[PDB]
Swiss-Prot record, chains A, B, C, D:
It comes from the Bacteria. Pathway: Amino-sugar metabolism; N-acetylneuraminate degradation; D-fructose 6-phosphate from N-acetylneuraminate: step 1/5. GO terms for molecular function: N-acetylneuraminate lyase activity. This is N-acetylneuraminate lyase. Catalyzes the reversible aldol cleavage of N-acetylneuraminic acid (sialic acid; Neu5Ac) to form pyruvate and N-acetylmannosamine (ManNAc) via a Schiff base intermediate. It is found in: Cytoplasm. The keyword Cell membrane does not apply. Changing K163A: Binds substrate but is unable to form a Schiff base. The gene is nanA.
Length: 292, 292, 292, 292
């Protein structure tokens, strides 16, 4: 399966007690495939509230997403953790389910050396036999990987490239220059246009769960050099994203899904579980203005 | 029980495959009680390599540590996690095992609001019925709590105080001024003297597993106003700690335990699991210089 | 004069004792106009080694640059300082010489409040009667100005816009969306393409003193939607910039000028004043690969 | 002259137009000598609003301060600048006025290399013949100097030690261990007690202009091992400092000087030049609570 193009970072529907709501999760998967018209789903990322969940819950989500998606789209499994044994267990399970690639966040909390980081990727790859996408998110992890360091990771032929949720466009250019055959997915939806201008191969985004139509337009128009139109659509997109961030990122994407009849559920504690009535009214304004 | 004084942050003995070495873990516990003469153990913190382990492995460690220490010292169980349901489950287990207080790291990775942080602490306390010590470690978590926010957390009468592994001595003084009946444990071993000079109630440290004799001397002498002797002991201690840090923190403390007949074992991947031979020899030099 | 387009941040030629070499400075001005084909010069910026100089030296550079350039190109005078009285003295002098606009760095070193920063700009504008361009360079100053704050600055109708030497492309987009008639000049030469993709109005850059031909090509091709070609030229440009940064930015640009018969002189202490012979040889390789 | 002990960082009296008020500056010098009973004065540092002034103004301040103080106290002249030629000119002037030592902030704004920083210090020392105190203020300058780097600076026998306006007590202890004969002055007044516990040789502080009685008490009680007493006085001191910081640091110290009859005047633009009315009243409350 071609892993280029537009991937939603899959949100998960939770019940009030924090358990997975399977019906709701399935409705989110279907909405992304049928209505957002994504090329793929990136499952178990930050957006899936993954790091607040048990290993069993993470397995449940992988199972559900794949059973619902079947073979209609590409599927990437984020299996990274501070616990390398958990990552390997999850990696094996997603690979056995048929996920097209794994991805793994750089290990965090502790200050791991680069050799420890490389061994972590190499271990998951060896144990699973699957492809690997390096998940880079400096603003959450505090981990910054340089161009030489990416080169060392890329010595393993099963590393396909990087989910680049980072704002350094000089690094972004140098990585494309140095490793032209390795892939890059942009991770900041509000910076899609300038990333696409530097030749990234796709994008993985939480806002694509509701704004997938615009996201594809910006990407395809930019690659075609229709910059004036791409920019107009990036401007509207970012008015919507600005509102979503101000109101509460995951809760507001979910409220926007609910407004279209998707049972997107609660957020998982210790995140705030439910929007206040004021913020629900704010999310309705965003719906009326940008997604009607 | 009295929770003041010197607490070692308990290191864990791992086998080559990353499983727990029960024999070796009870030896580290014994060495702390009998040879380091600590007031208590802080179990499942950063030093215990806790964040790289499964829920079951964390329970095992709590079980073994309590089974060995019995009633002889104070015991604090660090149960914090990005997963609040895990924290609750661990908090209940440790309470049922008889731990004298719980402690929990501020939830990390995601950027949680202060009301979400307070709700996390209040939830663990309500579910367990046990005491709580806030674990503050900004250099790992990126989370900074202010004096006013501590005041809000301390509105819950079961919050005893804070493990302050933080380098802001202005904040430290302000907290002791503002909340005189609440406890503070210093978390940076290499700054014990200046922290004790500001009236902290004890210390929780990784190096006390091997340097617990000097650590008690710095603390007790500083409190008695014997600054001359305390400083001399802090200088030697920091020669040892500078060496430990340069050679590899958890591995070098484990090696120093091994040199005293304690089966401290390997570190847990994704941490480097054993020292290079040259670094083994460096730790033997530290042992000769500072701990024989 | 039109202030859009390509502006070199003017380097200055120093003698061995740190005094201005007039003959060399005029050669630099001429090279930029006649060979780099710039739209204008930005005089007295970081690149001019401005902050290491006396007030009289800054005035002599303004005087010389303007006498050499006459009315052939646009000229912007950076007059910012921690000293507001100095900034006003320089602003008046540059305005009297006929500079097309002033620019001023946000006052730095001390942690100024935003109302202090706004008063600083309004004060320079009132005293001089000239236009003003806000010079934003967070990586040197530690000052970060937000969208709402730019709006307060832009309440003064003499503020034309901002020199944006910063790497936050979400802010960049939001600024162009919120204040579409105010101008933005890109300040990071190695990020020109993605900046131009978002509709910046020009660029101010140190490397344009030698790479002005390619810099204009990237900028014009990007705005025309010729991204494939713009990206190829940005990749070569960045191979050159990477080498310049590794070798020493100001000295290396001066070395590349010298190789074309421009007497670009020494750098000013406390910067290193001269390249080593090894680094001169390195600059010759850059010349042979990228500028021959 | 003995340079150990308590040094006020001299505040400067400005007129409404920003010019030096000589009468007010002499009154501040007198008040420090006669009422605060300081060991000495640190002239031309951040507290003196130095970096917002012209070279001539800085000279006037140095001349006036020495003329007023004569030989009654120690005097240190801060002459550092991004302009090394200015630093040398200022250093020569203060030296020939008879200042007991010079001091110089690490060059800032530009990202200077360590050999450039060392050459800056050696150059000022060579040109003046005077002793040098390294002025380290990381939170303003972003410059961090390590133990080994201080060793390299200390190879010049005229480098006496460091004004440590920094929060790292581990570094503080290491520097005192490594270079026992070199001096350290604490730069943060609100952390005087823990700095004194680690054996610093004195303190240089802005709040000593108004609170030098308690400052000397904390320093001396701490050095005698009377910690419970020192801590009490440190608590009251930090209540006053917390108020001062919240109300506006330099303006509020100046208001407290004015409330004791000293014509401490305005601050210099671009700093806010006078307190708002409500903040005048708050400063009055500080006077009544802590300095009456």
């Amino acid at each position: 399966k071609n892993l280029k193009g537009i991937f939603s970072a899959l949100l998960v529907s939770f019940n009030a007690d924090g358990s997975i709501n399977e019906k709701g999760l399935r409705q989110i998967v279907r909405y992304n495939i049928d209505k957002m018209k994504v090329d793929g789903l990136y499952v178990g990322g930050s957006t899936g509230e993954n790091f607040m969940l048990s290993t069993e819950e993470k397995k449940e989500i992988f199972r559900i997403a794949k059973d619902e998606a079947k073979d209609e789209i590409a599927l990437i499994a984020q299996v990274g953790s501070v616990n390398l044994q958990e990552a390997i267990e999850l990696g094996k399970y997603a690979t056995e389910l048929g996920y097209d690639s794994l991805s793994a966040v750089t290990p965090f909390y502790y200050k791991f050396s680069f050799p420890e980081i490389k061994h972590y990727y190499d271990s998951i790859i060896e144990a699973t036999g699957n492809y690997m996408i390096v998940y880079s998110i400096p603003f959450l992890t505090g981990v910054n990987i340089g161009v030489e360091q990416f080169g060392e990771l890329y010595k393993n032929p099963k590393v396909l490239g990087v989910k680049f949720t980072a704002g350094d466009f000089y690094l972004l250019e140098r990585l494309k220059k140095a490793y032209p055959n390795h892939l890059i997915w942009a991770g900041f939806d509000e910076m899609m246009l300038p990333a696409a201008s530097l030749g990234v191969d796709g994008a993985i985004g939480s806002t694509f769960n509701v704004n997938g139509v615009r996201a594809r337009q910006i990407f395809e128009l930019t690659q075609a050099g229709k910059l004036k139109e791409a920019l107009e659509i990036q401007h509207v997109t970012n008015d919507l994203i600005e509102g979503i961030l101000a109101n509460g990122l995951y809760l507001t994407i979910k409220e926007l899904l609910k407004l279209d009849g998707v049972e997107a559920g609660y957020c998982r504690e210790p995140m705030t579980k439910e929007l206040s009535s004021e913020k629900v009214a704010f999310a309705k304004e965003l719906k009326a203005k940008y997604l009607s």
